[PDB]
Structure 1
């Protein structure tokens, strides 16, 4: 039902998911002038040396690259987090044009796309239990700008033609997510939500300041995916981003400067 089309997009979601108008919704604009440096934040620890990718799925809205999260393999800790968060999947949001596509904005700047690495807090045992908790998930958000190609993204771009339509999947083993990180792990953090239904208020957002560069050709290939299933009229998968939501009673903290 819900999507990003002309009649089922973000402004409609509240009708099936009333939390869409909640107190800690994501994404948000990051006002860099008002984000406060927090000397008590730790450096982020991203430990992806043992990550085990399995499969890539066109989920009907984006594509998920899925990881084996049955053991402590690929974990995020440190930064603003307590305990250990296990990577379960990553996906992106992107635009129909380079001037839009990110969910978070920075001083109202939209990036071409935004990568989300989703992790769940191991103290809750599994992802389904974790999304029921205010500290259940940590999502690491990375902006994409269009410029030089990102070599470590090419393996993702090249498998997209095999999962063009909703519900298609493909084997996707041995992919190393370290190739999608920028040089600096300086970040902003704030408490928020999933940005798609069910919009649960269970996420500690960590958004890296430094964007990665991808080529125009790479993001053009994202835009050839389809929201529709096989044998249905083509709906290009573009503009699958939720706009900035009210910050309300929240502080965005900076790990730097």
Structure 2
């Protein structure tokens, strides 16, 4: 029943998922005046060279590019993390226009979209098991700013027409997620949650300071999928972002000043 509209959107989620008003919810606003530089924060290791993509799925609230996580292939290590986390999928959040779309904000600035690369801790058995743990997941968050095109995104935006209908998927092998990464791995980090129901508080967030540039042409293509439903004249998938939640009793640490 949950979604992003007036009657089932983010301000309604707490009824089905009370944890929506919990102590470690995401996203948040990253205020650069109060994020704390932490010299003990290690550089992030993003080792995606062996990535094996499988398919792309419209799950009714985003499109997910899913990966073979049956063995160590594309993994996240280092940074604030205690071990190895396997990439299982990435997806985006975006707006109904370019001025909004991101879930995290920086000094209240909204970006046109936000990329989430979702990884689970190989200390646990699988993704299902990991989301039940406070250190189960690591999500690498990357802002999308409109400008020059990101060439590594083109394969993704080109295939979206094939999965406009909720639930549909398409084969999506040999996509390399290294083509979605900015130059710098400077990051903010804090303990948080999934930003969609069930909103489980199982995520170490790592949000990159540097956005990637994508073109207006590219982000337009995100806006062609539908939210679950079919017709006769139903609803396109835009503004699938949760607004910033209160930081509460947490601290956002930065790997940089």
Alignment of 1:90-169 (within 5 A): 90-169=90-169
Shift of 1:233: 2.4
Normalising by structure 2, we get a TM-score of 0.99
Query: Which secondary structure does the structure 1 equivalent of 2:138 belong to?
Result: strand
Tell me the TM-score normalized by structure 1.
0.99
Deviation at 1:33, TM superposition (A): 1.1
Contact map agreement 2:26 2:194 (CA 8 A) in 1: yes
- Superimposed CA distance per residue, residues 199-249 of structure 1 (whole angstroms, 9 cap, x where no aligned partner): 000000000000000000111010111113445423111000000001000
User: Contact 1:76–1:86 at 8 Å: present in 2 too?
Assistant: yes
Task: Decide whether the 8 Å contact of 1:58 with 1:163 is kept in 2.
Answer: yes
Residue in structure 2 matched with residue 218 of structure 1 by the alignment: 218
The alpha carbon displacement at 1:6 in A equals: 2.1
8 A contact 2:191–2:204 mirrored in 1: yes
Kindly state the Cα deviation for residue 131 of structure 1 after the two structures are TM-superposed: 0.3
Residues 53 and 174 in structure 1, CA contact (< 8 A), matched pair in contact too: yes
Residues 79-131 of structure 1: CA distance to partner in whole angstroms, max 9, x if unpaired?
Answer: 00000000000000000011100000000000000000000000011001100
In 2, Cα distance between the equivalents of 1:194 and 1:32? 23
**CA offsets per residue over residues 62-88 of structure 1, 9 Å max, x none?**
000000000011100100000000000
Count of paired positions: 257
| Cα pair 2:85 2:120 within 8 Å, conserved | yes
Q: Is the 8 A contact 1:65 1:90 kept in 2?
A: yes
Measure, in 2, the Cα distance between the counterparts of 1:19 and 1:119: 21
Q: Which runs of 5+ in 1 are unaligned?
A: none
Measured on the aligned residues, the alpha-carbon RMSD in Å equals 0.8
Question: SS of 1:87's equivalent?
Answer: strand
* 2:69 match: secondary structure: coil
Q: Please list every run of at least 4 consecutive aligned residues from structure 1 whose deviation after the TM superposition is greater than 3 angstroms.
A: 228-232
Q: Is the 8 A contact 2:94 2:113 kept in 1?
A: yes
Q: Check whether the contact 2:61–2:228 (CA below 8 A) recurs between aligned residues.
A: no
What is the CA-CA distance between 1:165 and the residue it aligns to? 1.2
Matched, 1:57 2:90: no
In the alignment, is the contact (CA less than 8 A) between 1:90 and 1:117 conserved in 2? yes
Q: What is the deviation of 1:36?
A: 1.0
